[PDB]
């Protein structure tokens, strides 16, 4: 060391670093389009959701909160924004 590009760190290193210890901090979470077993809407769900998201016009739970990323109720199709 004693010479390194602190301004252009490798993408692998920036992915390995903690979300706050990167050069410019940013979230590691994302949003998901979940296809409900019903219809009329594609539901937007936070990856690290704290709430048991339910359908707008149904009564099935889309996700169950966990310590980190929420689950997906084991029946779901999901696209990532």
């Amino acid at each position: 060391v004693l010479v390194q590009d602190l301004l252009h760190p490798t993408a692998a290193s920036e992915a390995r670093k903690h979300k706050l210890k990167t050069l410019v901090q940013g979230p590691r979470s994302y949003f998901l389009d979940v296809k409900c077993p019903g219809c009329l809407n594609i539901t937007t769900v936070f990856s690290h959701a704290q709430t048991a998201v339910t359908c707008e016009s149904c009564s099935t739970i889309l996700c169950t909160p966990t310590g980190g990323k929420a689950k997906l109720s084991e029946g779901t199709s999901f696209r990532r924004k």
Binding site: L2, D5, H8, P9, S13
Partner: protein, 87 residues
């Protein structure tokens, strides 16, 4: 350092490390001067024709002389893919 009327009055203008740019003291016995032979027309290692690097005792003791030599060499040529600026 010079006096008035521009005469060099300081004896022993000293060398500096090629890595850290600090002075190589007279008693720094851990320092090294690395000379790499020049090459043209398929080798032959021209005698007396060198590229010179100074490594300080501090760098060598920290064990950074290897990486510093890689960087300086690649900066001057002599090496194609050893040192990467991004790490």
């Amino acid at each position: 350092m010079e006096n008035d009327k521009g005469q060099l009055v300081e004896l022993y203008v000293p060398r500096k490390c090629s890595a850290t740019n600090r002075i190589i003291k007279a008693d720094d016995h851990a320092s090294v001067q690395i000379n790499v032979a020049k090459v043209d027309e398929e080798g032959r290692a021209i005698p007396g024709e060198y590229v010179t690097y100074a490594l300080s005792g501090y760098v060598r003791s920290r064990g950074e002389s290897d990486d510093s030599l890689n960087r300086l060499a690649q900066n001057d040529g002599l090496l194609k893919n050893v040192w990467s600026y991004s790490r």
